[PDB]
Amino acid sequence: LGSMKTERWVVREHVEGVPDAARIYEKVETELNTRLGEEQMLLKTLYVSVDPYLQGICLDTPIGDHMGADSIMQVLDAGPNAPFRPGDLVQGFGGWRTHLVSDGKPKLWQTGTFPMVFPAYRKLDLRHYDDALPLSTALGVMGGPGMTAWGTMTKFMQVRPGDTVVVSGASGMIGTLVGQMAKRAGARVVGTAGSAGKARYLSQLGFDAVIDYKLADDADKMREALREAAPDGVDKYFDSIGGSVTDAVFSMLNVGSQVAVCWQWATQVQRDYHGPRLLPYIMFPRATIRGIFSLEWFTEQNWSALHEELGGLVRRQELVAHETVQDGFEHIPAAYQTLFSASESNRGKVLVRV
Amino acid sequence: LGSMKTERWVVREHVEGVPDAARIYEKVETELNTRLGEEQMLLKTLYVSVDPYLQGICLDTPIGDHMGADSIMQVLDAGPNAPFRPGDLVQGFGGWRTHLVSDGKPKLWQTGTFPMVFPAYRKLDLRHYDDALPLSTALGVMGGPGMTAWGTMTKFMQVRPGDTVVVSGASGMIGTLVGQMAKRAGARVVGTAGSAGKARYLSQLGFDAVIDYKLADDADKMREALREAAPDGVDKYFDSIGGSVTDAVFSMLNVGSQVAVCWQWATQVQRDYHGPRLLPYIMFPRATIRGIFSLEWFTEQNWSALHEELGGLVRRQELVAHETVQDGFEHIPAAYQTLFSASESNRGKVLVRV
Numbered sequence: 285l286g287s288m289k290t291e292r293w294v295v296r297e298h299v300e301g302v303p304d305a306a307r308i309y310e311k312v313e314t315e316l317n318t319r320l321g322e323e324q325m326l327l328k329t330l331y332v333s334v335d336p337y338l339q340g341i342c343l344d345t346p347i348g349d350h351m352g353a354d355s356i357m358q359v360l361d362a363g364p365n366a367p368f369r370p371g372d373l374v375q376g377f378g379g380w381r382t383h384l385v386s387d388g389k390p391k392l393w394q395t396g397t398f399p400m401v402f403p404a405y406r407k408l409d410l411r412h413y414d415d416a417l418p419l420s421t422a423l424g425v426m427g428g429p430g431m432t433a434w435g436t437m438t439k440f441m442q443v444r445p446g447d448t449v450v451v452s453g454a455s456g457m458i459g460t461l462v463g464q465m466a467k468r469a470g471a472r473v474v475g476t477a478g479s480a481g482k483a484r485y486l487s488q489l490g491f492d493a494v495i496d497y498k499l500a501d502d503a504d505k506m507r508e509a510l511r512e513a514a515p516d517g518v519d520k521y522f523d524s525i526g527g528s529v530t531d532a533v534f535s536m537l538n539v540g541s542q543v544a545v546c547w548q549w550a551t552q553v554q555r556d557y558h559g560p561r562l563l564p565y566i567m568f569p570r571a572t573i574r575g576i577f578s579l580e581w582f583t584e585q586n587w588s589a590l591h592e593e594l595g596g597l598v599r600r601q602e603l604v605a606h607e608t609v610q611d612g613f614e615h616i617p618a619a620y621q622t623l624f625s626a627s628e629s630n631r632g633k634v635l636v637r638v
Numbered sequence: 639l640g641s642m643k644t645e646r647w648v649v650r651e652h653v654e655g656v657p658d659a660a661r662i663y664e665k666v667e668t669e670l671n672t673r674l675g676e677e678q679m680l681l682k683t684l685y686v687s688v689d690p691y692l693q694g695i696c697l698d699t700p701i702g703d704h705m706g707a708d709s710i711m712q713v714l715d716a717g718p719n720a721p722f723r724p725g726d727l728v729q730g731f732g733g734w735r736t737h738l739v740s741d742g743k744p745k746l747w748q749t750g751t752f753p754m755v756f757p758a759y760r761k762l763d764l765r766h767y768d769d770a771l772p773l774s775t776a777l778g779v780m781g782g783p784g785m786t787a788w789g790t791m792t793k794f795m796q797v798r799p800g801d802t803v804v805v806s807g808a809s810g811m812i813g814t815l816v817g818q819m820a821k822r823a824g825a826r827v828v829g830t831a832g833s834a835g836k837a838r839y840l841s842q843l844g845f846d847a848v849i850d851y852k853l854a855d856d857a858d859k860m861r862e863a864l865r866e867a868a869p870d871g872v873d874k875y876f877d878s879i880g881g882s883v884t885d886a887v888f889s890m891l892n893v894g895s896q897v898a899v900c901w902q903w904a905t906q907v908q909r910d911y912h913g914p915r916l917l918p919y920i921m922f923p924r925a926t927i928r929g930i931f932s933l934e935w936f937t938e939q940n941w942s943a944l945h946e947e948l949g950g951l952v953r954r955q956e957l958v959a960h961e962t963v964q965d966g967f968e969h970i971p972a973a974y975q976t977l978f979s980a981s982e983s984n985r986g987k988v989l990v991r992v
């Protein structure tokens with residue numbers, strides 16, 4: 285049969301800490317075989333996600349392999365028993381590649397720290413998307429990030445009116461969704477941000493107080509900032525940061541509090557591996573801490589409820605989901621790099637349209 | 639009108655770390671005014687509990703005050719509007735005193751780390767007791783520690799046939815109670831213990847493996863023993879120790895695992911305040927970690943349930959609830975000292991008959 289020319293970003297070099305996109309990634313030209321097994325598909329990439337958790341995926345990617353990532357793909361061609369037909373849109377972990385072949389079946393992440401299984405590709409139905417909630421939201425508020433926020437806030441956390449909710453890593457999409465939902469449930473909402481503009485932006489989304497984690501560098505400076513922003517204690521904590529801000533929150537946990545652990549940026553990215561033992565602080569509060577791994581909620585029923593509940597709020601404008609769509613496959617690493625800059629222009633989910 | 643000489647153990651000196659019980663405490667004769675107020679009672683102590691959690695209570699007890707502890711008392715005299723009548727048997731936080739005047743209402747622990755409120759005295763009634771459930775069980779299987787184990791197993795942990803339940807600090811009444819209920823639900827149960835002789839005691843109670851925590855110094859050695867003792871990973875963990883055993887367990891948590899935090903001996907007594915950050919290990923397992931503070935279960939309906947459910951199994955000797963009752967009020971601090979220094983001989987709940 286035949287082949288096609290494709291471009292891929294591949295992992296050139298492993299560097300821990302804050303990644304250097306120009307140094308770690310290299311754009312190569314690749315020839316793709318277009319011969320399809322009975323259930324395989326030939327896919328074109330329309331949109332690609334960039335996310336912080338790619339820092340850890342990258343370090344587990346064999347050198348030379350392509351950078352994995354969440355993406356939106358269109359089926360160009362398909363074998364006879366492929367799950368989707370040409371023209372069908374799917375969301376899945378297609379990676380930083382213009383084109384690819386895959387059967388869309390669940391695949392195990394072999395070289396990762398845990399036995400993680402990337403989900404089967406998911407069919408996208410155009411009826412769910414419009415100008416208010418466009419197709420690219422399948423990578424954001426109607427995707428992984430939305431599912432993480434919405435699943436946590438309806439399957440685990442039980443915000444009550446009058447509660448104080450703290451959200452670390454609040455300026456990103458998952459943080460802002462959690463805060464806005466908490467607000468709807470009647471809570472005082474405290475966030476952390478890196479800039480006066482980002483802090484003002486969270487105040488526009490309805491955060492009642494925002495702490496600057498660059499001035500508050502230590503649990504001490506942090507404890508004081510929290511005690512001011514949350515004088516009555518903390519009832520819920522949505523944690524994407526860990527490290528010293530989380531150490532400070534655990535000193536002021538109220539009774540029956542709940543902590544959702546979504547990420548530990550300060551450990552994973554900043555390599556903060558040791559610190560004060562936190563478990564001694566949860567007994568009298570009777571606090572509940574749940575690890576979040578939102579892949580467990582990727583079910584057809586959860587996707588429908590996501591669209592009904594969360595999609596309605598976004599559409600009625602009762603809940604704001606911003607995205608920064610950068611254009612051009614060649615600018616994927618540059619767009620990924622801004623997740624770690626000091627630029628305040630990073631509103632919501634960062635995306636690349638290809 | 640009248641008075642009455644009594645003896646009390648008072649806190650002479652504050653000593654951090656492992657208690658030196660003969661240096662910390664001092665036995666004093668105290669004349670008690672027995673002119674009761676309207677809601678007040680005069681009570682006589684029949685038994686006292688000694689517990690590792692008394693180490694922190696003591697540290698928070700101002701010099702010269704009496705040492706608090708759980709006790710079984712008997713109402714000698716009672717004012718008109720007293721909540722109990724002479725001859726009534728009650729359980730409450732009477733402390734290391736031979737006699738005392740209290741109104742038995744709930745009381746705020748004004749000097750503690752946290753805002754703890756000691757419960758109101760609860761009446762005992764002799765009919766529920768016999769030689770299989772002696773009256774002294776209101777300080778163990780039918781008291782605080784029984785409420786701690788049964789409440790964790792029926793209100794938090796959901797042990798299912800085939801689980802591997804790990805229990806740190808398993809020789810005492812709470813740890814052994816957890817293991818036996820877990821075995822009754824179908825689990826493999828792993829404990830820790832300090833003596834070869836208690837290891838064989840736990841096994842004969844149903845434990846499928848017992849680590850020597852004294853032999854396994856650090857996290858590493860403890861992972862090796864746990865890898866051996868629980869090869870399918872940990873599904874439930876009942877923690878009373880924290881420190882390096884708990885660090886080990888968190889490296890091998892299964893998906894959906896439940897951790898219950900009962901105490902942190904390593905931090906409270908051994909002063910180990912820093913360690914590896916544990917929250918990074920719980921996201922992929924979706925672990926749930928709940929702090930235990932069984933005072934929230936001290937409810938009339940919950941006591942009834944504890945009798946019904948545990949009373950039967952205990953009397954039949956299905957579920958084994960041992961006690962070690964020392965004799966003599968002057969021996970209370972030495973009995974308490976054994977929990978830290980000479981526990982090799984103890985079996986279940988250490989109490990002291992006065």
Ligand SMILES: NC(=O)c1ccc[n+]([C@@H]2O[C@H](COP(=O)([O-])OP(=O)(O)OC[C@H]3O[C@@H](n4cnc5c(N)ncnc54)[C@H](OP(=O)(O)O)[C@@H]3O)[C@@H](O)[C@H]2O)c1
Nearest residue numbers: 336337453455456457458459477478482546547576577578
């Ligand atoms: N467990 C799961 O299932 C799961 C699922 C999806 C995602 N995640 C993770 O959860 C996180 C949430 O997603 P997101 O879209 O909301 O990411 P994100 O927060 O946008 O990631 C980068 C942001 O974090 C902030 N940040 C960086 N260092 C910080 C620090 N030391 N303290 C506080 N904030 C800091 C920055 O905000 P400023 O610009 O204001 O500094 C920046 O905008 C992501 O990191 C992702 O990897 C977990």
Ligand SMILES: NC(=O)c1ccc[n+]([C@@H]2O[C@H](COP(=O)([O-])OP(=O)(O)OC[C@H]3O[C@@H](n4cnc5c(N)ncnc54)[C@H](OP(=O)(O)O)[C@@H]3O)[C@@H](O)[C@H]2O)c1
Nearest residue numbers: 691807809810811812831832851878900901930931932981
């Ligand atoms: N959270 C709550 O609401 C609550 C309520 C009640 C009690 N608690 C606490 O829960 C624990 C259990 O109660 P219990 O009555 O069964 O007391 P216990 O376990 O008998 O307490 C002392 C025993 O723990 C063992 N131990 C000492 N150091 C250890 C270590 N590093 N690792 C493992 N075991 C060690 C010793 O047993 P060996 O003889 O085997 O060395 C000792 O006899 C205690 O810490 C108690 O204060 C908490």
Ligand SMILES: CC[C@@H]1C[C@@H]2C[C@H]3/C=C\C=C\C(=O)NCCC[C@@H]4NC(=O)/C(=C(O)/C=C/C=C/[C@H](O)[C@H]3[C@@H]2[C@H]1C)C4=O
Nearest residue numbers: 337340341354376377397400402403428552577578921922
């Ligand atoms: C096709 C759909 C897409 C598939 C994608 C799979 C996950 C991506 C990355 C997972 C990484 C991971 O599991 N360990 C890396 C080890 C370090 C660290 N330790 C963690 O426990 C952890 C995390 O829990 C991350 C969680 C991230 C959740 C995402 O939503 C989904 C992506 C999802 C939208 C960490 O990053």
Ligand SMILES: CC[C@@H]1C[C@@H]2C[C@H]3/C=C\C=C\C(=O)NCCC[C@@H]4NC(=O)/C(=C(O)/C=C/C=C/[C@H](O)[C@H]3[C@@H]2[C@H]1C)C4=O
Nearest residue numbers: 567568691694695708730731751754756757782906931932
């Ligand atoms: C009349 C009935 C009786 C009343 C008694 C009160 C508690 C005793 C001690 C509580 C201490 C306390 O809370 N802070 C000290 C702080 C350090 C440490 N940090 C904790 O979180 C913690 C603990 O949670 C203890 C939990 C203990 C549970 C007991 O069964 C009940 C006793 C109970 C049987 C600690 O010891």
